[PDB]
Symmetry: C3
Subunit: 245 residues, 3 copies
Amino acid sequence: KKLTIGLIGNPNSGKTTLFNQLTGSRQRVRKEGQFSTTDHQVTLVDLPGTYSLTSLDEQIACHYILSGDADLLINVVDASNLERNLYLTLQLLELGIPCIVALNMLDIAEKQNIRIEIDALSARLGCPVIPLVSTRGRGIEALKLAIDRYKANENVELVHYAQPLLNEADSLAKVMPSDIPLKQRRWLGLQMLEGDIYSRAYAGEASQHLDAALARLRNEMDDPALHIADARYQCIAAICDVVSN
Amino acid sequence: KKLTIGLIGNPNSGKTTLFNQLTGSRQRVRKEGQFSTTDHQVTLVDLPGTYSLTSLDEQIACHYILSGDADLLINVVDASNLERNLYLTLQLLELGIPCIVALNMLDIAEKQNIRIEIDALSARLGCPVIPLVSTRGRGIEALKLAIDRYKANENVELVHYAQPLLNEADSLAKVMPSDIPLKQRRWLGLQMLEGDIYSRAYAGEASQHLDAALARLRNEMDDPALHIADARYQCIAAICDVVS
Amino acid sequence: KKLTIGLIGNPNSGKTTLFNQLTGSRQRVRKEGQFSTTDHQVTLVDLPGTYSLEQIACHYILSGDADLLINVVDASNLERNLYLTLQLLELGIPCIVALNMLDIAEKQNIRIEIDALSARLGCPVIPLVSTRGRGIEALKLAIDRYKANENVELVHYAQPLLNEADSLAKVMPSDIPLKQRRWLGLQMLEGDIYSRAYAGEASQHLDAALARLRNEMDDPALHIADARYQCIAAICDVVSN
Ligand SMILES: CNc1ccccc1C(=O)O[C@H]1C(=O)[C@H](n2cnc3c(=O)[nH]c(N)nc32)O[C@@H]1COP(=O)(O)OP(=O)(O)NP(=O)(O)O
Ligand SMILES: CNc1ccccc1C(=O)O[C@H]1C(=O)[C@H](n2cnc3c(=O)[nH]c(N)nc32)O[C@@H]1COP(=O)(O)OP(=O)(O)NP(=O)(O)O
Ligand SMILES: CNc1ccccc1C(=O)O[C@H]1C(=O)[C@H](n2cnc3c(=O)[nH]c(N)nc32)O[C@@H]1COP(=O)(O)OP(=O)(O)NP(=O)(O)O
Ligand SMILES: [Mg+2]
Ligand SMILES: [Mg+2]
């Protein structure tokens, strides 16, 4: 079976280095690439670097991600700035898109005395985590194995939102276009409530209900947007707390 | 929703420090405090330091734990003396009280190059293990999340006792007051065969069988109390080697 | 209950050293020993070092005297040691991996996530350090808690290789379990010399099998070899350094 995979991560996380290591001379300027694993023929897409789906390169990556084109994503993460990198990781995982986290720059992490508990991160993200040193090629045989074994991400609980935030997000979600997966509709709901403007273009006509939703939320919490951001940071921090000491 | 959490740990593990970090000035003096999480309003109780549940401080904590006042416990554990601190941990988990182990003193354990594999510990304990990192509020952050996600401890076997010890503590448990849960009744029977005074008071009519129970045990094994302590030390040393 | 446990591993792993501490003896570093765990009286069989499947330890395994094995593995040379580890687990022999020589690995500065290895192997992994006796408590406890290995997929072979190994196994002797038969048919396609002794009826299908594979993959024996290398190197990169 043929597969389409997008490389997604922060700028300077090692995406191109990984792209070259996997494809080499089998590349075309979007930048596409071809390689073959044991079971699959792969098309690899070098998406432009981004910190958050929320900025000319940012919009290119975002629309592609939401389209549902690629079967699987290789989320390239810099191990030496784990916290900052995990914001994008969490977005992809909250969106329910099949993910493999490629832990890159482990040699820099090690030099800076940063140790990461791989399995513990995997347990909390709910997807495979593969250590990598892309410049030396170390870890490639493991990443290919992960692709062959790729199942759906564990439906593990990522962000623990206040219950009224979930109620209002699902209320907004049930009104967005039918062709969008519920998991993506709920996330878009959250985005809108937080103040993400660009997020409205994908929410169809649900934006009309936004201002009244926040009015309702202001009766049960001090600042709805603050509570969203709080819950998200708590998720990132709790991961780093257990995973990286 | 109101939750009541008790802080239990060895002397000098950092209970009050964590108590003060969680509650701030929302505290009165026993020392009780107040702090909120995403889903709950939490009442935190700072219990006295004790090495075991087996002076007054041993009874104060132990009587509190068995009273069922607390919905769950935060077990503050010194990371720089893991083996010493885990005896209490093993006891709470044998009791079946919902526990969250909080690893404190990360700085000291760093000084003497101690590394602990957190998830490996969690798996063998059956409860979450939360490091108390102070940078960027990571510890408190993770602790609060664990409180909102608290459930019953995982039913993983902890200590491996010899069969006659299990059979004997089991029969004693079948005799104790029916207003106490079974898992607690089994643990009480285990403590009695070791020779605990505080247990026999809780045990009631079970203490009438103790002499018969010990005698019956004395045929197969020479010393039951030692065998209980040894199996507990075995389990603790076994955990420490796989985990650090 | 009585149990027979065999000590298997590479040459110079601490295999005989572990035999000395578990039993209560001292030997120059096949001998039998005796020790009692909490629930069992255990007969411990020390075997000579072997990298693969030297002929001394080879027979003791593929016979059926032992109920469980203690696979002694050097932590300083994990990648080298795991080839045998993988063999025992692909055969589905109940075993407890005993990581030894951790003081040497720590001196060379190598860190291992023990539970991440254990999850991938599907069996208990116990850190030791024999000379400075440490993991003896955790090992005895692992024996008492013995059970079947986890049905986790180890090596990822190409689908056509699996089809061939399957069809060979279906005609193989009935007395041997499926997991042992599937491994043998897969050793035949790689070209294992001392395999036809157990193949029985599978030899009259071996010639046609190879030709059916070579029509759709350019080296069946190397793909078997490559897949095993990939599996070991994947495990090592995710777990160590
Ligand atoms: C020749 N310049 C350098 C001198 C010293 C150190 C690094 C470089 C260098 O070439 O920078 C790259 C590199 O190889 C170095 N690097 C990549 N992977 C590794 C790695 O795995 N380990 C180490 N030590 N360094 C690495 O990081 C840098 C960025 O990598 P990418 O361009 O692949 O990252 P990207 O995500 O494609 N950026 P973008 O397209 O979003 O803007
Ligand atoms: C501010 N005074 C001090 C100056 C230098 C060293 C210690 C102190 C001190 O006040 O002692 C405490 C402290 O901050 C120090 N400490 C607490 N946490 C840490 C910690 O995380 N790192 C270091 N280095 N020291 C810590 O430990 C000591 C005991 O902490 P707790 O009272 O929280 O422990 P407890 O379990 O409530 N005692 P108890 O009620 O069982 O008898
Ligand atoms: C006598 N001392 C030596 C002098 C030169 C080179 C090596 C040693 C030596 O350490 O001998 C043993 C030892 O203490 C040392 N050693 C053993 N265990 C440990 C160990 O756990 N840690 C450290 N640091 N050293 C260890 O290496 C040797 C272990 O040999 P075994 O027979 O136990 O290994 P084996 O797998 O049974 N031999 P084989 O039949 O498989 O071929
Ligand atoms: Mg690039
Ligand atoms: Mg105190």
